[PDB]
Scaffold this motif. Structure first.
Motif, PDB file in Angstrom:
ATOM      1  N   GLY A  39      -0.040  -2.771  12.991  1.00  0.00           N
ATOM      2  CA  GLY A  39       0.993  -1.757  12.994  1.00  0.00           C
ATOM      3  C   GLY A  39       0.613  -0.501  12.253  1.00  0.00           C
ATOM      4  N   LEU A  40       1.176   0.615  12.697  1.00  0.00           N
ATOM      5  CA  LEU A  40       0.876   1.908  12.108  1.00  0.00           C
ATOM      6  C   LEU A  40       1.018   1.986  10.599  1.00  0.00           C
ATOM      7  CD1 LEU A  40       2.511   4.265  14.714  1.00  0.00           C
ATOM      8  CD2 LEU A  40       0.104   3.679  14.511  1.00  0.00           C
ATOM      9  N   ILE A  41       2.163   1.558  10.067  1.00  0.00           N
ATOM     10  CA  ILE A  41       2.403   1.628   8.627  1.00  0.00           C
ATOM     11  C   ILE A  41       1.461   0.722   7.837  1.00  0.00           C
ATOM     12  CG2 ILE A  41       4.085   1.392   6.732  1.00  0.00           C
ATOM     13  CD1 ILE A  41       4.777   3.623   8.594  1.00  0.00           C
ATOM     14  N   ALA A  42       1.329  -0.535   8.253  1.00  0.00           N
ATOM     15  CA  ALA A  42       0.421  -1.451   7.554  1.00  0.00           C
ATOM     16  C   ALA A  42      -1.004  -0.890   7.529  1.00  0.00           C
ATOM     17  CB  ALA A  42       0.416  -2.832   8.217  1.00  0.00           C
ATOM     18  N   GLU A  43      -1.468  -0.400   8.673  1.00  0.00           N
ATOM     19  CA  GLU A  43      -2.817   0.167   8.744  1.00  0.00           C
ATOM     20  C   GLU A  43      -2.954   1.407   7.837  1.00  0.00           C
ATOM     21  OE1 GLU A  43      -3.226  -1.352  13.401  1.00  0.00           O
ATOM     22  OE2 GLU A  43      -3.176   0.791  12.925  1.00  0.00           O
ATOM     23  N   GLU A  44      -1.917   2.236   7.793  1.00  0.00           N
ATOM     24  CA  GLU A  44      -1.924   3.422   6.942  1.00  0.00           C
ATOM     25  C   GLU A  44      -2.037   3.009   5.457  1.00  0.00           C
ATOM     26  OE1 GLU A  44       1.789   5.526   6.825  1.00  0.00           O
ATOM     27  OE2 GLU A  44       1.124   6.790   5.146  1.00  0.00           O
ATOM     28  N   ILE A  48      -5.231   3.176   1.944  1.00  0.00           N
ATOM     29  CA  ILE A  48      -5.073   3.809   0.633  1.00  0.00           C
ATOM     30  C   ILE A  48      -5.870   2.947  -0.353  1.00  0.00           C
ATOM     31  CG2 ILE A  48      -3.451   4.457  -1.211  1.00  0.00           C
ATOM     32  CD1 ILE A  48      -1.237   4.684   0.999  1.00  0.00           C
ATOM     33  N   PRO A  49      -6.913   3.520  -0.976  1.00  0.00           N
ATOM     34  CA  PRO A  49      -7.733   2.760  -1.929  1.00  0.00           C
ATOM     35  C   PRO A  49      -6.998   2.006  -3.058  1.00  0.00           C
ATOM     36  CG  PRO A  49      -8.857   4.769  -1.328  1.00  0.00           C
ATOM     37  CD  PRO A  49      -7.413   4.901  -0.833  1.00  0.00           C
ATOM     38  N   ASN A  50      -5.988   2.632  -3.671  1.00  0.00           N
ATOM     39  CA  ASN A  50      -5.225   1.998  -4.760  1.00  0.00           C
ATOM     40  C   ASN A  50      -4.303   0.875  -4.290  1.00  0.00           C
ATOM     41  OD1 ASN A  50      -4.618   4.901  -6.967  1.00  0.00           O
ATOM     42  ND2 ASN A  50      -6.339   3.474  -6.787  1.00  0.00           N
ATOM     43  N   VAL A  51      -4.211   0.670  -2.981  1.00  0.00           N
ATOM     44  CA  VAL A  51      -3.342  -0.358  -2.417  1.00  0.00           C
ATOM     45  C   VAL A  51      -4.115  -1.580  -1.924  1.00  0.00           C
ATOM     46  CG1 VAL A  51      -1.765  -0.939  -0.512  1.00  0.00           C
ATOM     47  CG2 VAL A  51      -1.623   1.332  -1.658  1.00  0.00           C
ATOM     48  N   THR A  52      -3.602  -2.772  -2.235  1.00  0.00           N
ATOM     49  CA  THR A  52      -4.195  -4.024  -1.749  1.00  0.00           C
ATOM     50  C   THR A  52      -3.062  -4.765  -1.038  1.00  0.00           C
ATOM     51  OG1 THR A  52      -5.724  -4.242  -3.615  1.00  0.00           O
ATOM     52  CG2 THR A  52      -5.263  -6.221  -2.280  1.00  0.00           C
ATOM     53  N   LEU A  53      -3.263  -5.099   0.237  1.00  0.00           N
ATOM     54  CA  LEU A  53      -2.221  -5.807   0.990  1.00  0.00           C
ATOM     55  C   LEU A  53      -2.476  -7.297   0.996  1.00  0.00           C
ATOM     56  CD1 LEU A  53      -1.891  -3.666   4.279  1.00  0.00           C
ATOM     57  CD2 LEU A  53      -0.602  -3.390   2.140  1.00  0.00           C
ATOM     58  N   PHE A  54      -1.401  -8.075   0.969  1.00  0.00           N
ATOM     59  CA  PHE A  54      -1.488  -9.542   0.996  1.00  0.00           C
ATOM     60  C   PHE A  54      -0.576  -9.971   2.132  1.00  0.00           C
ATOM     61  CE2 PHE A  54      -2.432  -8.190  -3.277  1.00  0.00           C
ATOM     62  CZ  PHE A  54      -3.550  -8.943  -3.591  1.00  0.00           C
ATOM     63  N   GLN A  55      -1.174 -10.356   3.255  1.00  0.00           N
ATOM     64  CA  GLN A  55      -0.403 -10.728   4.438  1.00  0.00           C
ATOM     65  C   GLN A  55       0.062 -12.171   4.473  1.00  0.00           C
ATOM     66  OE1 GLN A  55      -4.728 -11.610   5.679  1.00  0.00           O
ATOM     67  NE2 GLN A  55      -3.609 -10.284   4.230  1.00  0.00           N
ATOM     68  N   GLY A  56       1.287 -12.354   4.946  1.00  0.00           N
ATOM     69  CA  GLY A  56       1.825 -13.686   5.046  1.00  0.00           C
ATOM     70  C   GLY A  56       3.320 -13.675   4.884  1.00  0.00           C
ATOM     71  N   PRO A  57       3.969 -14.808   5.186  1.00  0.00           N
ATOM     72  CA  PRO A  57       5.418 -14.921   5.067  1.00  0.00           C
ATOM     73  C   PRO A  57       5.826 -15.145   3.631  1.00  0.00           C
ATOM     74  CG  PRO A  57       4.544 -17.037   5.642  1.00  0.00           C
ATOM     75  CD  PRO A  57       3.382 -16.043   5.744  1.00  0.00           C
ATOM     76  N   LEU A  58       7.046 -14.745   3.311  1.00  0.00           N
ATOM     77  CA  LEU A  58       7.601 -14.953   1.982  1.00  0.00           C
ATOM     78  C   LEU A  58       8.311 -16.306   1.983  1.00  0.00           C
ATOM     79  CD1 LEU A  58       9.140 -11.391   1.469  1.00  0.00           C
ATOM     80  CD2 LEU A  58       7.109 -12.396   0.331  1.00  0.00           C
ATOM     81  N   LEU A  59       8.931 -16.629   3.117  1.00  0.00           N
ATOM     82  CA  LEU A  59       9.680 -17.878   3.297  1.00  0.00           C
ATOM     83  C   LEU A  59       8.841 -19.088   2.937  1.00  0.00           C
ATOM     84  CD1 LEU A  59      12.183 -19.385   4.372  1.00  0.00           C
ATOM     85  CD2 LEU A  59      11.115 -19.308   6.629  1.00  0.00           C
TER      86      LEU A  59
END
Ligand SMILES: NC(=O)c1ccc[n+]([C@@H]2O[C@H](COP(=O)([O-])OP(=O)(O)OC[C@H]3O[C@@H](n4cnc5c(N)ncnc54)[C@H](O)[C@@H]3O)[C@@H](O)[C@H]2O)c1
Ligand SMILES: [Cl-]
Ligand SMILES: [Cl-]
Ligand SMILES: [Cl-]
Ligand SMILES: [Cl-]
Ligand SMILES: [Cl-]
Ligand SMILES: [Cl-]
Length: 324
Positions: A39-44, A48-59
């Motif tokens: 998705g556009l937002i996730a890819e954007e 960003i170098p200062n950002v680290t994404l952790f994918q997965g469900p919260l449930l």
């Protein structure tokens, strides 16, 4: 004075995304959960170098929560009902934050439970958050609760419920909803103003804001006034029409339908306040609902600016042609 690491969930949602962009630009490292990396937002955000994404469900995924909070000192948590279990997730997140031991200031995005203030039903996608707020308050870490006003960018000419700025055959626009034409509602430019306000709360610190509820709204406008702002912005006739039932022109998830039905009762029938809590209701000066937010962020944008500068672009990006 090194910028502290902030943990957030639902990173692609408007509130979190707003905070992430400005936080990263001023030096904060961000640990952000996303349901999926596409998705556009996730890819954007991933770019960003200062950002680290952790994918997965919260449930039922406390492990992801422990990972998210590892090394974080600040948190901004905004849940959704999508997965169901919003109360359980909000509680799990709060417990994970406390468990990390390093969260100095936990901001939870809350909403009201209207059934506590009048002969009104609880709005289903709002009341559950208040339950999480009550739970968070009992935890041994500083916490602050922000209450989001109605998003300026909820507006679209696509046939989506409640906030449709309908394009009429003659080129004029009409907004139909159950809200009383003249009662002022709290609005918010989510994209531009949520992030800067949240950052100021973090800058101010836990001693000043622990236990506080802050209405994240920078301007109040009645439906009639909203239409007048769109009219001035677009140089077109824009008028409001009060309708008892929300015009549901597309298929929607049952949970959303129930949300809309409660809104017809609360706002349509009862004309109850959007923020029903007592505190949001010579020389003596009473605090207005927008006071704290405006003090937090002076650069907020109004409805007229949204209608004239952003709405035409969002509309074009959605395939609409009236601005062509
Ligand atoms: N729109 C408003 O005016 C308004 C006002 C006050 C409060 N709120 C609250 O804001 C909350 C939503 O937050 P937001 O505005 O920052 O985000 P959002 O509406 O901008 O989008 C949520 C994002 O989360 C993703 N997502 C969330 N849960 C998911 C799941 N279980 N599976 C797949 N994807 C999932 C969606 O794809 C979407 O991109 C709601 O709980 C709502 O009640 C909204
Ligand atoms: Cl900081
Ligand atoms: Cl997300
Ligand atoms: Cl995604
Ligand atoms: Cl990155
Ligand atoms: Cl506490
Ligand atoms: Cl449909």
């Amino acid at each position: 004075q090194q910028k502290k690491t902030i943990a957030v969930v639902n990173a692609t949602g408007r509130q979190a995304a707003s905070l992430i962009r400005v936080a990263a630009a001023v030096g904060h490292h961000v640990r952000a959960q996303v349901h999926s990396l596409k998705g556009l937002i996730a890819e954007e955000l991933q770019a960003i170098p200062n950002v680290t994404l952790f994918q997965g469900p919260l449930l039922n995924n406390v492990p992801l929560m422990d990972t998210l909070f590892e090394g974080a000192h600040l948190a901004f948590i905004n849940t959704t009902s999508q997965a169901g279990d919003e109360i359980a997730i909000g509680k799990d997140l709060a417990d994970a934050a406390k468990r990390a031991g390093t969260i100095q200031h936990y901001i939870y995005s809350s909403m009201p439970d209207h059934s506590l203030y009048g002969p009104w039903p609880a709005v289903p996608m709002w009341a559950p958050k208040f339950t999480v707020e009550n739970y968070v308050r009992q935890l041994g870490l500083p916490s602050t609760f922000v209450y989001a006003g109605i998003y300026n960018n909820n507006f679209t000419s696509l046939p989506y419920p409640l906030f449709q700025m309908e394009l009429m055959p003659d080129g004029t626009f009409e907004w139909h909803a159950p809200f009383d034409p003249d009662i002022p509602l709290p609005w918010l430019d989510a994209e531009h103003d949520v992030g800067p306000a949240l950052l100021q709360i973090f800058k101010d610190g836990p001693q000043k804001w622990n236990g506080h509820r802050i209405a994240l709204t920078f301007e109040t406008l009645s439906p009639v006034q909203v239409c007048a702002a769109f009219s001035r912005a677009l140089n077109r006739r824009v008028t409001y029409v009060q309708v008892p039932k929300v015009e549901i022109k597309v298929n929607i998830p049952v949970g959303y339908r129930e949300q809309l039905e409660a809104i017809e009762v609360v706002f349509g029938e009862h004309k109850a306040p959007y923020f029903p809590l007592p505190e949001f209701s010579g020389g003596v000066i009473s605090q207005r609902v927008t006071d704290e937010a405006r003090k937090l962020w002076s650069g907020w944008r109004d409805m007229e600016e949204y209608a004239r500068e952003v709405f035409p672009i969002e509309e074009e990006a959605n395939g609409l042609d009236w601005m062509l």
